[PDB]
Amino acid sequence: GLFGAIAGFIENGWEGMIDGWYGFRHQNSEGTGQAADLKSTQAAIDQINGKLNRVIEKTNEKFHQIEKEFSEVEGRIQDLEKYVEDTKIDLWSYNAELLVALENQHTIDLTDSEMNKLFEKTRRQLRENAEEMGNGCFKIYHKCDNACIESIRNGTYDHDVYRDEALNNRFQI
Amino acid sequence: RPWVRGLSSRISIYWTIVKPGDVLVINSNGNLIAPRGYFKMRTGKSSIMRSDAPI
Ligand SMILES: *[C@@H]1O[C@H](CO)[C@@H](O[C@@H]2O[C@H](CO)[C@@H](O[C@@H]3O[C@H](CO)[C@@H](O)[C@H](O)[C@@H]3O)[C@H](O)[C@H]2NC(C)=O)[C@H](O)[C@H]1NC(C)=O
Numbered sequence: 001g002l003f004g005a006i007a008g009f010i011e012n013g014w015e016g017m018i019d020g021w022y023g024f025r026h027q028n029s030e031g032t033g034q035a036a037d038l039k040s041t042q043a044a045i046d047q048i049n050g051k052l053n054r055v056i057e058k059t060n061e062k063f064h065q066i067e068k069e070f071s072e073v074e075g076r077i078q079d080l081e082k083y084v085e086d087t088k089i090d091l092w093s094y095n096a097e098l099l100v101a102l103e104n105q106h107t108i109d110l111t112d113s114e115m116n117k118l119f120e121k122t123r124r125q126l127r128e129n130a131e132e133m134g135n136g137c138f139k140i141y142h143k144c145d146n147a148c149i150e151s152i153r154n155g156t157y158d159h160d161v162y163r164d165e166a167l168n169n170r171f172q173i
Numbered sequence: 174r175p176w177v178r179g180l181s182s183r184i185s186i187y188w189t190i191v192k193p194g195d196v197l198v199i200n201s202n203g204n205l206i207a208p209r210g211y212f213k214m215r216t217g218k219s220s221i222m223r224s225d226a227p228i
């Protein structure tokens with residue numbers, strides 16, 4: 001949406017990731033793996049469930065009102081009675097339409113936003129030790145086994161610990 | 174009037190609400206279809222609906 005990550009710079013989604021909404025896929029020396037990011041996944045969920053509650057909140061609750069179906073023709077009062085209901089239904093039918101179109105647009109942008117935030121954050125962790133391949137993947141210019149990937153994923157990766165190694169491979173080997 | 178259940182005469186119904194401390198006074202010289210008391214009035218969540226739907 002407004003951001004460019006979803007259906008944007010991230011070519012497509014992973015039909016296989018069934019444990020989270022947003023996630024990681026790496027390929028190091030030891031092999032390949034996948035893991036959902038529970039943190040960003042819950043931010044999107046919380047926000048969506050938050051609007052869901054607002055929307056499907058608490059009901060009209062009306063009792064004795066006015067008649068809406070008529071068996072005999074009467075003119076003036078009956079005319080006005082019907083117009084009152086008609087213009088009402090019309091105004092509530094617009095509200096419902098618009099409300100659903102606004103929310104939907106926002107839900108998309110918002111979920112596009114949480115993707116793009118996962119990216120920048122992960123990007124800010126890698127410091128000078130990586131480059132962005134432009135497809136949502138970072139090329140890590142240093143040996144990174146599984147415990148190394150895990151630290152990125154869990155937010156504890158220290159970039160100094162691999163900087164020079166990184167810098168070396170990066171800048172003309 | 175057209176025959177309706179034998180008859181060709183009719184009866185017109187009217188009503189009167191008596192507020193506390195006020196008095197009702199029926200006064201006539203014929204054709205009256207007098208009352209037999211009053212119905213209590215309650216304000217609340219009640220209403221009415223037309224439907225041949227099962228309950
Ligand atoms: C004014 O005209 C009306 C309209 O024609 C007259 O009403 C008619 O009165 C007769 C009784 O003389 C009604 O007859 C009944 O018909 C039923 C239904 O089939 C039957 O069960 C009985 O055996 C009897 O014959 C007739 O229905 C009724 N017509 C209508 C259309 O309601 C009325 O009598 C006239 N009054 C005067 C004072 O001239």
Ligand SMILES: *[C@@H]1O[C@H](CO)[C@@H](O)[C@H](O)[C@H]1NC(C)=O
Binds near residue numbers: 150152
């Ligand atoms: C991050 O990764 C390393 C390697 O597996 C581990 O020692 C560290 O404690 C992890 N932190 C969390 C919060 O899981």
